[PDB]
């Protein structure tokens, strides 16, 4: 069909050409005249025309002012129109003899009728059809979406249409895919993998039990599916008796009830952070905050505080340093109660004396204040020190006096210094608050 | 002390009174109670 | 698993040399006698031959119809038995079969389809079958040889469609007769595949 109708075409060059457009289809169906009418709706906004040289040259160039796809096709043929209807026996019935019209099967798409209908004018007189009468495939487009289509892959070797697939969504609600072809210039593998991936990305249906058949790959365990978790949990009606035990009275006790917090957002810290603490023991404690220190982009300073040092020798030595963006107390860490008091506590006092000498410092940045299980977030031991709370206690406090100069209480597990090198970093840089 | 199967088809349901509260005198029972294991366990306890 | 895949089929002229080769896969093939059971166009098996194993002998039993015509061999390190079929009449068109087993016929194959036929391939006749007042229907007398395939409506009707199983004249020629039952208009196209020869045919009374 297509090379007997392309052979006898050959001869109508000369005479009239093919153009096609994405102009509206309003403005050019207005201005067409001289033997020139619409080949093809191929959208709201794309209408391919039809009609003789010399206006339908000059209705490119039109569109080159309307900065609309202007193409003077190159394999410019007399179709539609009446320079090909006169030959009713080599462009009529040579091209297609022998046919055979097939049943349902899976819905094809006729255009020149504007919906999907099989006759027998299509295996045999759909050519007669076509050179006859327009193409309204904008119509059939519009009856493609009505019976569930939107993915439409161009097959080409550029993409011409698919680009005006999208003009039929650009104006209508069921905006539609169209997956980019081949570009012009495209024809090779590597491109044709990159539109099979974009059709897969549209909505494609691809039986990838077909493109590694050849490949003889295997396949590898890969990560499984990412859940993005919620928090989804239900809490019993009748837990404990629907309250805390007995009853209940019209007063009502608080509690604390230690709730899983972020551990903060890390962010690359500066100038220096001060692991400020005694010097008494040598400390795996200072060796494992560090590490994350330095490594937060500070360096890493010692400052050896002793018990009642003076509420000023740290101010001059956090001066001496220069600027600091926090510092973290691990004077708190395995430390027991002096049995004489237990307010008595040598860190409570280092603690105060660092909090005012950071003051008096006028440094301005946020202390941290590592405790070994001075809290728990769950009774699964005993408080290693209640004494040790009381720098809690005193914390609470401090924030609202030196929201600056306090930046909180960074409890951890008694004896286990792993939890610090995991999360300290973005605990005292955490933006969580 | 003979090959006999039991296959008891049954739903969780709700019985007693909501474990995590316990009991007086249903407390270490409760457990051996509202479970829809031991509900074929007991039957092939008690006949062997 | 014992497959018995035949191959070496064809359309021959009478007094020809055809070749049936029989490749077994799934069993040792020199324990078994595999045989050649020939089933002329619908009608009962009638058994060709047999060769006997070669530890058995590899005696060649073969039939009254077709003794100094045909001759049957087995090979182990290539694993194939063959029916040699020499000096074909028209009696060998048929679906010869390849049993592994002399009196206990087992996987039996496939079905190599054997012509000899002194014809040669010509388009059908498509001559219409006028309603007496009803049916509808169509013969594509003289036409060889099979493949063929007839529609109505051109693949629309396809309730009460009847492709009558073709045919053979004594000319060599096939004819089939496709007929659709429906009161009334319709049409037939028959696609000789061979000559590649597709002629259509609208009827009325």
């Known amino acids: 069909v297509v090379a007997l109708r392309s052979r006898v075409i050959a001869t109508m060059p000369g005479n009239k050409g093919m153009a096609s457009i994405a102009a509206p289809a309003g403005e050019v169906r207005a201005r067409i005249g001289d033997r020139v009418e619409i080949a093809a709706v191929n959208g709201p906004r794309s209408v391919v025309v039809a009609g003789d040289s010399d206006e339908l040259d000059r209705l490119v160039a039109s569109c080159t002012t309307e900065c609309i796809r202007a193409k003077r096709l190159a394999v410019d043929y007399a179709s539609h129109s009446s320079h090909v209807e006169t030959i009713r026996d080599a462009l009529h019935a040579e091209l297609g003899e022998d046919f055979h019209p097939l049943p349902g099967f899976v819905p094809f798409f006729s255009t020149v009728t504007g919906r999907w209908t099989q006759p027998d004018e299509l295996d045999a007189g759909y050519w007669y059809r076509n050179l006859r009468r327009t193409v309204r495939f904008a119509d059939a487009v519009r009856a493609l979406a009505e019976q569930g289509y939107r993915t439409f892959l161009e097959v080409s070797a550029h993409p011409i249409l698919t680009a005006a697939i999208e003009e039929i969504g650009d104006g209508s609600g069921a905006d539609l895919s169209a997956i980019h072809s081949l570009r012009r210039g495209d024809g090779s593998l590597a491109d044709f993998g990159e539109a099979l991936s974009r059709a897969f990305a549209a909505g494609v249906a691809v039986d990838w039990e077909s493109v590694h058949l050849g490949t003889g790959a295997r396949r590898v365990p890969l990560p499984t599916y990412p859940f993005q978790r919620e928090r989804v949990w239900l809490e019993p009606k009748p837990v404990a008796r629907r309250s805390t035990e007995v009853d209940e009275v019209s007063a009502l006790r608080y509690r604390i009830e230690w709730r899983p917090t972020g551990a903060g957002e890390p962010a690359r810290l500066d100038g220096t952070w001060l692991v400020a603490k005694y010097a008494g023991t040598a400390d795996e404690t200072s060796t494992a905050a560090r590490e994350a220190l330095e490594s937060a982009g500070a360096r890493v300073r010692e400052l050896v505080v002793d018990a009642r040092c003076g509420r000023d020798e740290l101010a001059e030595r956090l001066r001496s340093v220069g600027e600091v963006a926090g510092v973290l107390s691990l004077l708190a860490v395995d430390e027991a109660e002096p049995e004489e008091a237990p307010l008595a506590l040598a860190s409570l006092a280092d603690t105060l004396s660092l909090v005012q000498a950071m003051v008096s410092a006028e440094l301005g940045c946020p202390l941290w204040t590592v405790t070994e299980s001075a809290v728990a977030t769950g009774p699964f031991e005993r408080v290693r020190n209640a004494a040790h709370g009381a720098l809690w206690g005193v914390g609470r406090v401090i924030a609202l006096e030196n929201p600056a100069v306090w930046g909180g209480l960074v409890d951890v597990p008694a004896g286990s210094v792993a939890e610090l090198a995991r999360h300290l970093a973005a605990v005292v840089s955490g933006g969580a608050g | 002390a003979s090959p006999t199967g039991v296959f008891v088809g049954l739903i969780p349901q709700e019985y007693g009174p909501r474990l995590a509260e316990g009991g007086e005198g249903v407390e270490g029972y409760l457990m051996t109670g509202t479970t829809t294991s031991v509900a074929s366990g007991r039957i092939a306890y008690t006949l062997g | 698993e014992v497959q018995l895949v035949q191959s070496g089929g064809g359309l021959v002229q009478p007094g020809r040399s055809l070749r049936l080769s029989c490749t077994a896969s799934?069993?040792?093939?020199?324990?078994?006698?595999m045989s050649w059971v020939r089933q002329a166009p619908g009608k009962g098996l009638e058994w060709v031959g047999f060769?006997?194993?070669?530890?058995?002998?590899?005696?060649?039993e073969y039939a009254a119809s077709v003794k100094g015509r045909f001759t049957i061999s087995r090979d182990d390190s290539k694993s194939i038995a063959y029916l040699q079929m020499n000096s074909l009449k028209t009696e060998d068109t048929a679906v010869y079969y390849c049993?592994?087993?002399?009196?206990?016929?087992?996987?039996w194959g496939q079905g190599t389809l054997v012509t000899v036929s002194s014809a040669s391939t010509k388009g059908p006749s498509v001559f219409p079958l006028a309603p007496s007042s009803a049916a509808l229907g169509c013969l594509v007398k003289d036409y060889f040889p099979e493949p063929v395939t007839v529609s109505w409506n051109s693949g629309a009707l396809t309730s009460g469609v009847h492709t009558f199983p073709a045919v053979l004249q004594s000319s060599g020629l096939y004819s089939l007769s496709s007929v659709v039952t429906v009161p009334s208009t319709y049409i037939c196209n028959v696609n000789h595949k061979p000559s590649n020869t597709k002629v259509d045919k609208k009827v009325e009374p």
């Open positions: 049993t592994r087993g002399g009196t206990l016929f087992d996987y």
């Open positions: 060769i006997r194993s070669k530890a058995y002998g590899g005696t060649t």
């Open positions: 799934g069993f040792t093939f020199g324990d078994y006698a």
